[PDB]
Design a protein around this motif. Structure first.
Motif, PDB file in Angstrom:
ATOM      1  N   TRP B 333       0.839  -1.190   0.000  1.00  0.00           N
ATOM      2  CA  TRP B 333       0.000   0.000   0.000  1.00  0.00           C
ATOM      3  C   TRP B 333       0.877   1.244   0.000  1.00  0.00           C
ATOM      4  CZ3 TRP B 333      -2.661   2.928   4.431  1.00  0.00           C
ATOM      5  CH2 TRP B 333      -3.564   3.850   3.892  1.00  0.00           C
ATOM      6  N   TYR B 334       0.458   2.255  -0.754  1.00  0.00           N
ATOM      7  CA  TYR B 334       1.238   3.469  -0.946  1.00  0.00           C
ATOM      8  C   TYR B 334       0.415   4.691  -0.568  1.00  0.00           C
ATOM      9  CZ  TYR B 334       3.699   7.262  -3.327  1.00  0.00           C
ATOM     10  OH  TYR B 334       4.335   8.443  -3.629  1.00  0.00           O
ATOM     11  N   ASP B 335       1.013   5.580   0.223  1.00  0.00           N
ATOM     12  CA  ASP B 335       0.426   6.871   0.565  1.00  0.00           C
ATOM     13  C   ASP B 335       1.369   7.950   0.050  1.00  0.00           C
ATOM     14  OD1 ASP B 335      -0.937   9.049   1.643  1.00  0.00           O
ATOM     15  OD2 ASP B 335      -1.452   7.969   3.481  1.00  0.00           O
ATOM     16  N   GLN B 336       0.923   8.688  -0.969  1.00  0.00           N
ATOM     17  CA  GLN B 336       1.786   9.671  -1.614  1.00  0.00           C
ATOM     18  C   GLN B 336       2.019  10.893  -0.737  1.00  0.00           C
ATOM     19  OE1 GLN B 336      -1.603   9.088  -1.954  1.00  0.00           O
ATOM     20  NE2 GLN B 336      -1.992   9.756  -4.062  1.00  0.00           N
ATOM     21  N   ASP B 337       1.072  11.215   0.146  1.00  0.00           N
ATOM     22  CA  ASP B 337       1.185  12.427   0.951  1.00  0.00           C
ATOM     23  C   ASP B 337       2.426  12.391   1.834  1.00  0.00           C
ATOM     24  OD1 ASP B 337      -0.887  14.194   0.225  1.00  0.00           O
ATOM     25  OD2 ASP B 337      -2.365  12.944   1.261  1.00  0.00           O
ATOM     26  N   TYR B 338       2.595  11.318   2.600  1.00  0.00           N
ATOM     27  CA  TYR B 338       3.739  11.169   3.487  1.00  0.00           C
ATOM     28  C   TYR B 338       4.842  10.308   2.890  1.00  0.00           C
ATOM     29  CZ  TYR B 338       0.122  12.750   6.729  1.00  0.00           C
ATOM     30  OH  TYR B 338      -0.894  13.450   7.338  1.00  0.00           O
ATOM     31  N   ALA B 339       4.696   9.884   1.636  1.00  0.00           N
ATOM     32  CA  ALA B 339       5.629   8.965   0.986  1.00  0.00           C
ATOM     33  C   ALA B 339       5.825   7.709   1.836  1.00  0.00           C
ATOM     34  CB  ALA B 339       6.966   9.649   0.694  1.00  0.00           C
ATOM     35  N   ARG B 340       4.703   7.069   2.155  1.00  0.00           N
ATOM     36  CA  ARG B 340       4.680   5.912   3.037  1.00  0.00           C
ATOM     37  C   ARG B 340       4.377   4.645   2.252  1.00  0.00           C
ATOM     38  NH1 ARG B 340       4.822   6.874   8.509  1.00  0.00           N
ATOM     39  NH2 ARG B 340       3.487   5.228   9.371  1.00  0.00           N
ATOM     40  N   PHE B 341       5.121   3.585   2.555  1.00  0.00           N
ATOM     41  CA  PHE B 341       4.897   2.265   1.981  1.00  0.00           C
ATOM     42  C   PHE B 341       4.592   1.306   3.120  1.00  0.00           C
ATOM     43  CE2 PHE B 341       6.319   2.501  -2.498  1.00  0.00           C
ATOM     44  CZ  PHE B 341       6.727   3.816  -2.503  1.00  0.00           C
ATOM     45  N   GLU B 342       3.382   0.764   3.131  1.00  0.00           N
ATOM     46  CA  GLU B 342       2.943  -0.136   4.185  1.00  0.00           C
ATOM     47  C   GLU B 342       2.562  -1.481   3.585  1.00  0.00           C
ATOM     48  OE1 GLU B 342       0.491   1.491   7.275  1.00  0.00           O
ATOM     49  OE2 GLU B 342       0.519   3.492   6.378  1.00  0.00           O
ATOM     50  N   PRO B 345      -3.536  -3.154   3.939  1.00  0.00           N
ATOM     51  CA  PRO B 345      -4.392  -3.181   5.130  1.00  0.00           C
ATOM     52  C   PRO B 345      -5.161  -4.489   5.219  1.00  0.00           C
ATOM     53  CG  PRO B 345      -4.632  -1.116   3.928  1.00  0.00           C
ATOM     54  CD  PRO B 345      -3.875  -2.044   3.037  1.00  0.00           C
ATOM     55  N   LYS B 346      -5.188  -5.060   6.423  1.00  0.00           N
ATOM     56  CA  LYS B 346      -5.828  -6.346   6.660  1.00  0.00           C
ATOM     57  C   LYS B 346      -7.275  -6.203   7.102  1.00  0.00           C
ATOM     58  CE  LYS B 346      -2.109  -8.158   8.608  1.00  0.00           C
ATOM     59  NZ  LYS B 346      -0.975  -9.056   8.962  1.00  0.00           N
ATOM     60  N   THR B 347      -7.941  -5.126   6.696  1.00  0.00           N
ATOM     61  CA  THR B 347      -9.345  -4.943   7.033  1.00  0.00           C
ATOM     62  C   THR B 347     -10.178  -6.065   6.426  1.00  0.00           C
ATOM     63  OG1 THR B 347      -8.947  -2.558   6.989  1.00  0.00           O
ATOM     64  CG2 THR B 347     -11.235  -3.300   7.041  1.00  0.00           C
ATOM     65  N   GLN B 348     -11.060  -6.645   7.237  1.00  0.00           N
ATOM     66  CA  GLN B 348     -11.865  -7.784   6.818  1.00  0.00           C
ATOM     67  C   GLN B 348     -13.298  -7.344   6.569  1.00  0.00           C
ATOM     68  OE1 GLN B 348     -10.225 -10.631   5.796  1.00  0.00           O
ATOM     69  NE2 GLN B 348      -8.811  -8.972   6.327  1.00  0.00           N
ATOM     70  N   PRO B 349     -13.813  -7.519   5.353  1.00  0.00           N
ATOM     71  CA  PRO B 349     -15.212  -7.171   5.082  1.00  0.00           C
ATOM     72  C   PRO B 349     -16.175  -7.987   5.929  1.00  0.00           C
ATOM     73  CG  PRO B 349     -14.221  -8.406   3.264  1.00  0.00           C
ATOM     74  CD  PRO B 349     -13.105  -7.928   4.130  1.00  0.00           C
ATOM     75  N   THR B 350     -17.300  -7.367   6.273  1.00  0.00           N
ATOM     76  CA  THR B 350     -18.361  -8.064   6.981  1.00  0.00           C
ATOM     77  C   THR B 350     -19.178  -8.907   6.001  1.00  0.00           C
ATOM     78  OG1 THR B 350     -19.566  -5.974   6.849  1.00  0.00           O
ATOM     79  CG2 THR B 350     -18.557  -6.543   8.956  1.00  0.00           C
ATOM     80  N   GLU B 351     -19.975  -9.827   6.555  1.00  0.00           N
ATOM     81  CA  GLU B 351     -20.671 -10.800   5.716  1.00  0.00           C
ATOM     82  C   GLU B 351     -21.657 -10.128   4.768  1.00  0.00           C
ATOM     83  OE1 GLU B 351     -22.843 -13.923   7.787  1.00  0.00           O
ATOM     84  OE2 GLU B 351     -22.876 -15.060   5.907  1.00  0.00           O
ATOM     85  N   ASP B 352     -22.397  -9.129   5.253  1.00  0.00           N
ATOM     86  CA  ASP B 352     -23.301  -8.390   4.381  1.00  0.00           C
ATOM     87  C   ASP B 352     -22.551  -7.566   3.342  1.00  0.00           C
ATOM     88  OD1 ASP B 352     -22.510  -6.821   6.722  1.00  0.00           O
ATOM     89  OD2 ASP B 352     -23.804  -5.250   5.897  1.00  0.00           O
ATOM     90  N   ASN B 353     -21.234  -7.420   3.487  1.00  0.00           N
ATOM     91  CA  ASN B 353     -20.434  -6.620   2.571  1.00  0.00           C
ATOM     92  C   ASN B 353     -19.382  -7.436   1.818  1.00  0.00           C
ATOM     93  OD1 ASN B 353     -20.869  -5.038   5.395  1.00  0.00           O
ATOM     94  ND2 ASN B 353     -21.379  -3.707   3.666  1.00  0.00           N
ATOM     95  N   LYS B 354     -19.587  -8.748   1.646  1.00  0.00           N
ATOM     96  CA  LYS B 354     -18.671  -9.523   0.807  1.00  0.00           C
ATOM     97  C   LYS B 354     -18.519  -8.919  -0.580  1.00  0.00           C
ATOM     98  CE  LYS B 354     -17.048 -11.109   3.057  1.00  0.00           C
ATOM     99  NZ  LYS B 354     -16.498 -10.641   4.359  1.00  0.00           N
ATOM    100  N   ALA B 362     -13.659   2.009   2.922  1.00  0.00           N
ATOM    101  CA  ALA B 362     -13.603   1.810   4.366  1.00  0.00           C
ATOM    102  C   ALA B 362     -12.571   2.725   5.010  1.00  0.00           C
ATOM    103  CB  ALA B 362     -13.296   0.346   4.682  1.00  0.00           C
ATOM    104  N   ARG B 363     -11.393   2.848   4.392  1.00  0.00           N
ATOM    105  CA  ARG B 363     -10.361   3.717   4.947  1.00  0.00           C
ATOM    106  C   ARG B 363     -10.804   5.174   4.945  1.00  0.00           C
ATOM    107  NH1 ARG B 363      -5.797   3.416   6.469  1.00  0.00           N
ATOM    108  NH2 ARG B 363      -4.690   1.452   6.861  1.00  0.00           N
ATOM    109  N   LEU B 364     -11.438   5.625   3.862  1.00  0.00           N
ATOM    110  CA  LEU B 364     -11.927   6.999   3.828  1.00  0.00           C
ATOM    111  C   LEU B 364     -13.003   7.229   4.881  1.00  0.00           C
ATOM    112  CD1 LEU B 364     -10.509   8.932   2.212  1.00  0.00           C
ATOM    113  CD2 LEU B 364     -12.175   8.732   0.357  1.00  0.00           C
ATOM    114  N   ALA B 746      10.166  -4.729   8.672  1.00  0.00           N
ATOM    115  CA  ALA B 746      10.052  -6.031   8.042  1.00  0.00           C
ATOM    116  C   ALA B 746       8.585  -6.359   7.769  1.00  0.00           C
ATOM    117  CB  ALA B 746      10.681  -7.097   8.936  1.00  0.00           C
ATOM    118  N   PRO B 747       8.313  -7.282   6.844  1.00  0.00           N
ATOM    119  CA  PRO B 747       6.919  -7.646   6.570  1.00  0.00           C
ATOM    120  C   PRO B 747       6.238  -8.208   7.808  1.00  0.00           C
ATOM    121  CG  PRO B 747       8.429  -9.206   5.557  1.00  0.00           C
ATOM    122  CD  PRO B 747       9.248  -8.038   5.995  1.00  0.00           C
ATOM    123  N   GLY B 748       4.965  -7.851   7.974  1.00  0.00           N
ATOM    124  CA  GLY B 748       4.194  -8.249   9.129  1.00  0.00           C
ATOM    125  C   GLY B 748       4.341  -7.348  10.335  1.00  0.00           C
TER     126      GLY B 748
END
Lengths: 524, 1027
Positions: B333-342, B345-354, B362-364, B746-748
């Motif tokens: 994942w890339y954020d251009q504002d802060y020049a961040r590389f992550e 995101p491990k956000t998990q959708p809910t069942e009604d939102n598969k 979701a992030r916004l 490191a990853p994770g």
């Protein structure tokens, strides 16, 4: 089987009278009644044993186990003699030993008249402790304890409190709760029950009361709050003089909330001296001994000076008495110089004048430090010498901060010799004289000013030189005498007696550049 | 004629010294040149005492002509020997003209290779394809320019110097270049497709116009989660790529779908360096009609291997399998504002939102909910205002009774606060240089208060107004702000506050953060432990009253896990300041470190008994651990794979120090520099955390090329990165030195944030923004020109040191004084009977000693206040007054009419007159000689202000060097070694090694441990979060 017993320390109410400190009593100034008791013995057996041993009926005494609270206080808590009477003391204390218990009994002089121990309802009654603060004497008077329903109103206890303290009835009283050291909370509403008036109400809480009287404003601690505050910050400091070896010092009681000026004034008072004539030293604090010196402008408090002592250790402070005011003593400049005595011999001396002073003050210290001539002038002067050459004379008004800080610079103090003040201006001339071995660059020795007459018998001048030097006689012979000018040197025949001013003055009207000087050659 | 012959011999000898020293190295500074000149032993045959700075200043013309004559005979692609920074500064001081005579002699080791691993080598060789693609005209007035045959013998030294200055200057430090806008914000072209048909029934029936489907047909099967290329309007931008995160039919509009965009590597900071087949996630998604769909493209989420810690050193071709590089793929994942590389995101959708979930949506949503200042709990109601018990903002929860920051303009005190001369024109005879004197300031720190209540105003309808929240605050007078003014804050604790009773009202949006303000007696422990326990902890002892200007006791109503230390490898530790800062953070135990320089190794050994230090080049040990050895030539056990956990360091940038675009020679040097070896170390060992530090310019080195390439190599490695710059002075140091920091996880793991500023500072040295390829990058710092703690001033850094004079060399001296400033208290310790160490300053020349002895003590005074008085010296020589033999038009004559010029060069187009120079003068000759061309050399020979701060890092203090002011405010001495270490923030107990020069260098080079601790705390905040 010593490990199966425990010391149970019984404290009576007579120990509560007279205590001037926090809570009920001082742990050190208390008499206990110690019992060595089997851990498995029941509470009832111990209550029977106490009643029989001390001579009261078992139903005429109440047991109040002494328990520590979260706030750091130590107050009586509830014990149920019936319900809990069969449990061992070792399980009741939760692994505590010695176990102190307050024993509440009926006054034998009020018990001989038939009165007995009032009943106490654990759920609805409470045990209040009453203290009286006297601002005039600045002291506490233990006014016993009382059983009172939790729901009872303070106003109904006011007449009791008044006549229990010896006050005329219906006297207006200022009431406080002593929550803990440094926390004394005024009771604003007298019409509310004890439950409402006292947050987290327990047995053993202490309410202090005093007269409401304008006279209290003449006392330096009009109310118990400032009294308990001043008590919270009082500390006894042991002052010791660092010059006296192993000086035990004297102890003065002061407040932590104190700056340098007050401490210095106090110590000066107890020492009968001017505060400025004292310098203080903080303690090392792991070891016992003088540490970092303290400046006069130190903006800290007493706690900062004592902060690395443990509360058990005696808190020591070192000091020394001074001959000069502390500001001038902190502004003294280590001044290493050479003193010239009547015998024309150099001595190493170190003086400590004030940094913002003139040459006059330096010479005055040196005069107090040295001896003068038999009947010489008695006036001193300050020469500045570098590379064994006199580079200047300092006028007595010169500032000490403008003095040549270089290590090559040597300051000499000397009495003006008799034979140089007034000479014959068109006949006698003062010439600068110095030593040197082999060539003229490698100069050495103590240079000096020598008078020279006109057409004068050179062996007179060399016996004058000898009068100055005065060494064994027959090394004089190896002196090679020369006249040096701009590096050139012409040796002078000693028995020819060649002397006249012309060979010692520079070119006409010349000062700025080196004047001819007399050179001596020998080995040191 | 003996003096002239001796002078000629001295000129020849100094020319030999300078030429051989320049042979030895080409990176020495002016101070090192000074040291080499003075330390040189004079010959036995020639009768002279010792070489001083005056000797070099007076033999400059001969030494420079000899230096240029050496390099004018044999010309190669190597940089000429007279553009070394020290020699260039010497030219800048003395008005020497270049390119005359020369050729008077009468007919008179390896490129090396860094031990880069295969993948790092692969990345460097990969970008090597693009480095080959390829105003300030010659002066024409020098003799070299006039010579006939650009030509190797017609190279203009003046233009070479100007080009060197251009390569040194930042081009350009414009504020904006506004912040980058949203990507794909332009319109996209409509595609003419044949048929579009849904397959199956509506998967989810939301009940509104939206009915969610699964499979669409556009002559190809499309499902949610597939990747689609799009052709937008041709605006010189390539094809867009996006994943169809939701497909649904709207009863109002046509066929609709939500597209979550990707971002190509070229669009990020990576630019051309990125692999064209590589992509990154981003928080940009939008609704669009499927009519704009162009075609289906396949991408793969290249997840890191489960044995990622053991993947360092293996051949990438072995791991290149398979079908690569053939298709697109994303990993970060890339954020251009802060020049961040992550990591994604491990956000998990809910069942009604598969089948309609979008990570960008979701992030916004969570971000917009987070920023909204929302009150939480109702407490009480009044006819006009409604009361609340707590509130929140920016992911922080505030309650009634929490210390609260406030911007300096939030409220005013009841004290009168600030209550508001000119000297006569000094004598131009005594002071012939005063006329050259002439003819933003650090803000007050955050106001700190305690909430009394939180409330909101009732609206006209009576309903509470939740748009705004009004907060009532009890103010905490800092020691500065009380009637005793700033001097009350010289001694007091940095935390210390004073309770008051005045109440202020502020808007909730003005609140900038939570700080814990607490009593000093109800504290369960000593206040020192509370202060050092954690950030933003302030303690108040006694209340201050302003009406009576007095101090009282506060009213009663004002009163109220450990993860294992990581094994650390520190590359290029130096003296180990970074390691000490890490230990202060308590997150790291350094077990190994590398350092070529012997004194630094000995200093690290003394300061760290339980650590191994290797005194060899890092390449040798790296190659050794590739080859599989376990003990070095000296038997020390080198760490193996998996032993190191945190890898931190900062390499020198001497071989690529320029800023201009890359060159074949510059890169041939750079590929085998130390930074590539550092990257290879990080590749092989696979630390958990990775810290890189360097000077500020390192961000814009070779047009940001070094930063871009390092980031590309790390991203290929699979890490998570960010970068920025930090102002050291903001973290409890009395120095201005911006440092560029690269953070990697490191990853994770969790990517560490940059630590927020603590001490307010001068905004003139707070420019933390970065320009890269005409884009503005700002780190995640949220505090700008504000903070809790006041500045750290030089008075709160050297005041109570015992007085010592020039040439002092007493290694062990008594303190002779208790600590007086908070910084000093924190530096000394809790035990008070030490022997203060290394309080030694340089032993300079007697003439210079007198010069700086006569400088006045007024703040900011410098050489411009030097009296022209004949003064005696220590050696016995004579210091003549400065004689004015010319007149300058630009400045005019004195009020007394005396001449102001010093050389013939004052007249326009007039050569410097030989024999018109002066030397061994109390006031220098070069300073009046060349004041006009360098802004009067303002600040040189100046004294550090008691309220200012160190101009820059101090590696070798010298009055006329470029390191700014180096003079003690009061004592006639330069800042001493202990004083230099006190500037950086080193604890007083810290030990050093070597002579005075080495000690000064070790103090100068190391990172300020207060900065290292400030980083060290932030990394630990990520170690705790994972567990």
């Amino acid at each position: 089987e010593a490990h199966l017993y425990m010391q149970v320390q019984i404290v009576a109410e007579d120990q509560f009278c007279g205590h001037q400190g926090n809570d009920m009593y001082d742990e050190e100034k208390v008499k206990y009644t110690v019992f060595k008791v089997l851990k498995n013995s029941s509470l009832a057996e111990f209550v029977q044993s106490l009643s029989q041993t001390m001579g009261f009926p078992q139903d005429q005494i109440r047991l109040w186990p002494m328990q520590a609270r979260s706030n750091g206080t130590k107050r009586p808590a509830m014990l149920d003699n019936e319900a809990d009477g069969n449990k061992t003391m070792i399980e009741l204390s939760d692994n505590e030993n010695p176990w102190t218990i307050f024993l509440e009994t009926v006054d034998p002089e009020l018990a001989a008249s038939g009165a007995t121990l009032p009943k106490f309802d654990k759920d609805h009654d409470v045990m209040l402790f009453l203290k009286m603060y006297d601002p005039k004497t600045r002291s506490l008077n233990y006014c016993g304890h009382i059983y009172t329903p939790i729901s009872c109103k303070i106003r109904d206890l006011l007449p009791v409190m008044c006549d229990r303290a010896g006050f005329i009835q219906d006297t207006s009283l200022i009431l406080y709760e002593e929550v803990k050291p440094n926390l004394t909370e005024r009771i604003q509403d007298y019409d509310v029950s004890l439950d409402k008036a006292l947050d987290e109400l327990m047995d053993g809480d202490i309410i202090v009361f005093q007269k409401d009287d304008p006279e209290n404003d003449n006392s330096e601690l009009p109310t118990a709050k400032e009294y308990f505050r001043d008590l919270y910050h009082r500390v006894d400091v042991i002052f010791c003089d660092k010059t006296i070896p192993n000086d035990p010092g004297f102890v003065v009681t002061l407040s932590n909330r104190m700056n340098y000026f007050q401490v210095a004034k106090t110590v000066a008072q107890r020492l009968n001296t001017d505060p400025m004539l004292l310098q203080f030293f903080k303690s090392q604090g792991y070891r016992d001994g003088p540490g970092n010196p303290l400046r006069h402008n130190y903006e800290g408090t007493l706690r900062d000076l004592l902060q690395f002592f443990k509360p058990r250790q005696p808190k020591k402070l070192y000091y020394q008495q001074l001959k000069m005011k502390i500001t001038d003593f902190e502004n003294r400049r280590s001044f290493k110089c050479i003193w010239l005595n009547s015998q024309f011999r150099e001595e190493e001396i170190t003086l400590y004048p004030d940094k913002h002073g003139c040459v006059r003050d330096l010479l005055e210290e040196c005069k107090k430090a040295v001896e003068l001539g038999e009947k010489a002038s008695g006036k001193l002067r300050l020469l500045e010498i570098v590379s064994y050459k006199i580079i200047g004379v300092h006028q007595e008004d010169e500032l000490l901060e403008c003095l040549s800080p270089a290590t090559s610079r040597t300051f000499r103090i000397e009495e003006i010799p008799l034979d140089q003040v007034d000479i014959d201006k068109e006949n006698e001339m003062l010439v600068t004289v110095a030593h040197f071995h082999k060539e003229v660059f490698g100069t050495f020795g103590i240079p000096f000013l020598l008078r020279i007459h006109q057409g004068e018998h050179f062996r007179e001048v060399m016996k004058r030189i000898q009068s100055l030097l005065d060494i064994q006689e027959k090394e004089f012979e190896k002196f090679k005498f020369a006249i040096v000018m701009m590096g050139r040197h012409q040796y002078i025949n000693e028995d020819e007696y060649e002397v006249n001013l012309k060979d010692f003055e520079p070119q006409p009207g010349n000062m700025s550049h080196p004047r001819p000087w007399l050179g001596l050659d020998h080995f040191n | 004629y003996a003096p002239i012959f001796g002078l000629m011999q001295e000129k020849i000898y100094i020319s030999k010294i300078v030429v051989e020293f320049l042979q030895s190295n080409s990176d020495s500074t002016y101070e090192d040149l000074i040291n080499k000149i003075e330390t040189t032993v004079p010959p036995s045959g020639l009768n002279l005492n010792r070489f001083t700075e005056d000797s070099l200043l007076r033999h400059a013309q001969f030494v420079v002509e000899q230096v240029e004559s050496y390099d004018e005979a044999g010309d190669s692609d190597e940089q000429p020997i007279f553009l070394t920074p020290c020699m260039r500064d010497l030219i800048k001081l003395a008005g020497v003209t270049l390119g005359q005579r020369r050729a008077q002699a009468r007919r008179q080791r390896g490129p090396t290779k860094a031990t880069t691993t295969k993948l790092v080598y692969q990345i460097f060789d990969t970008f090597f394809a693009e480095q080959i693609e390829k105003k300030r005209r010659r002066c024409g007035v020098c003799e070299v320019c006039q010579q006939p045959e650009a030509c190797q013998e017609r190279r203009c030294p003046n233009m070479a110097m100007k080009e060197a200055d251009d390569d040194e200057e930042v081009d350009d430090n414009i504020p904006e270049m506004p912040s980058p806008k949203k990507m794909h914000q332009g319109k996209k072209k409509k595609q003419n497709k044949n048929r579009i048909s849904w397959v199956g029934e509506a998967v989810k029936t939301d009940g509104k116009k939206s009915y969610y489907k699964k499979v669409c047909i556009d002559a190809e099967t499309l499902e949610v989660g597939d990747c689609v290329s799009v052709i937008p309007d041709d605006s010189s931008k390539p094809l867009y790529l996006a994943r169809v995160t939701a497909l649904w039919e709207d009863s109002s509009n046509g066929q609709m779908f939500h597209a979550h965009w990707f971002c190509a590597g070229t669009d990020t900071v990576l630019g051309a360096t990125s692999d064209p087949l590589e992509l990154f996630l981003v928080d940009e998604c939008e609704d669009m009609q499927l009519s704009y769909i162009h075609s289906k493209v396949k991408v793969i989420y290249k997840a890191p291997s489960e044995n990622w810690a053991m993947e360092g050193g293996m051949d990438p071709e072995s791991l290149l399998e398979g079908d690569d590089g053939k298709t697109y793929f994303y990993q970060l994942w890339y954020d251009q504002d802060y020049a961040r590389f992550e990591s994604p995101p491990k956000t998990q959708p809910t069942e009604d939102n598969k089948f309609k979930f979008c990570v960008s949506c979701a992030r916004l949503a969570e971000m917009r909910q987070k920023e909204i200042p929302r009150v939480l709990e109702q407490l009480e109601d009044l006819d006009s205002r409604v009361l609340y018990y707590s509130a929140t903002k920016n992911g922080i929860l505030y309650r009634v009774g929490d210390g609260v920051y406030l911007p300096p303009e939030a409220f005013t005190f009841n004290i009168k606060l600030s209550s508001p001369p000119r000297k006569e024109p000094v004598d131009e005879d005594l002071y012939p240089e005063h006329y050259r004197k002439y003819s933003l300031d650090a803000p007050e720190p955050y106001r700190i208060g305690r909430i009394k209540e939180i409330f909101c105003p009732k609206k006209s309808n009576g309903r509470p107004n939740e748009t705004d929240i009004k907060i009532r605050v009890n103010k905490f007078y800092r020691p500065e702000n009380t009637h005793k003014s700033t001097p009350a804050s010289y001694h007091a604790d940095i935390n210390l506050l004073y309770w008051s009773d005045e109440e202020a009202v502020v808007d909730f949006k003005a609140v900038q953060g939570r700080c814990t303000v607490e009593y000093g007696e109800d504290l369960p422990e000593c206040v020192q432990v509370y202060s050092m326990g954690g950030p933003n902890r302030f303690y108040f002892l006694e209340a201050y009253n302003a009406k009576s200007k007095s101090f009282e006791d506060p009213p009663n109503h004002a009163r109220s896990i450990k993860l294992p230390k990581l094994r650390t490898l520190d590359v290029f530790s130096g003296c180990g300041g970074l390691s000490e800062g890490f230990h202060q953070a308590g997150i790291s135990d350094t077990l190994w470190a590398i350092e070529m320089w012997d004194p630094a190794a000995q200093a690290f050994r003394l300061n760290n008994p339980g650590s191994t230090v290797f005194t060899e080049d890092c390449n040798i040990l790296l190659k050794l651990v590739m080859a599989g050895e376990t003990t070095n030539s000296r038997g020390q056990r080198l760490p193996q794979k998996g032993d190191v956990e945190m890898l931190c360091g900062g390499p020198p940038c001497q071989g690529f120090s320029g800023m201009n675009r890359f060159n074949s020679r510059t890169y041939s040097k750079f590929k085998n520099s130390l930074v590539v070896s550092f990257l290879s170390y990080c590749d092989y060992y696979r630390p958990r955390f990775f810290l890189l530090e360097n000077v500020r310019n390192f961000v814009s080195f070779k047009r940001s090329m070094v930063l871009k390439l390092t980031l590309r190599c790390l991203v290929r490695m699979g890490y998570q990165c960010t970068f920025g710059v930090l102002q050291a002075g903001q973290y409890g140091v009395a120095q201005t030195r911006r440092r560029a920091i690269i953070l990697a996880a490191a990853p994770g793991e969790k990517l560490p944030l940059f630590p927020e500023p603590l001490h307010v500072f001068a905004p003139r040295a707070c420019q933390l923004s970065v320009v890269v390829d005409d884009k503005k990058f700002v780190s995640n710092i949220t505090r700008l020109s504000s903070g809790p703690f006041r500045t750290i001033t030089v008075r709160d850094t050297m005041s109570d040191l015992p007085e010592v004079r020039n040439g002092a060399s007493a290694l062990e001296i008594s303190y002779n004084g208790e600590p007086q400033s908070w910084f000093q208290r924190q530096l000394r310790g809790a035990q008070y009977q030490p022997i203060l160490r290394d309080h030694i300053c340089k032993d300079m020349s007697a003439l210079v000693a007198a010069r700086m002895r006569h400088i006045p003590l007024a703040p900011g005074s410098d050489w411009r206040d030097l009296p022209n008085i004949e003064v005696r010296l220590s050696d016995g020589t004579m210091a003549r007054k400065l004689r004015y033999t010319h007149h300058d038009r630009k400045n005019g004559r004195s009020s007394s009419g005396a001449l102001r010029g010093v050389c013939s060069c004052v007249e326009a187009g007039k050569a410097c007159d030989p024999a018109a120079r002066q030397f061994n003068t109390l006031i220098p000759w070069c300073l009046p000689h060349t004041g006009n061309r360098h802004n009067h050399w303002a600040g040189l020979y100046g004294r550090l202000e008691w309220d200012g701060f160190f101009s820059t890092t101090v590696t070798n203090p010298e009055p006329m060097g470029k390191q700014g002011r180096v003079l003690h405010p009061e004592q006639h001495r330069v800042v001493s070694v202990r004083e230099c270490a006190r500037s950086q923030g080193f604890p007083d107990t810290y030990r050093l090694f070597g002579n005075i020069l080495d000690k000064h260098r070790q103090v100068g080079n190391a990172v300020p441990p207060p900065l290292a601790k400030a980083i060290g705390l932030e990394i630990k905040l990520c170690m705790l979060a994972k567990a």
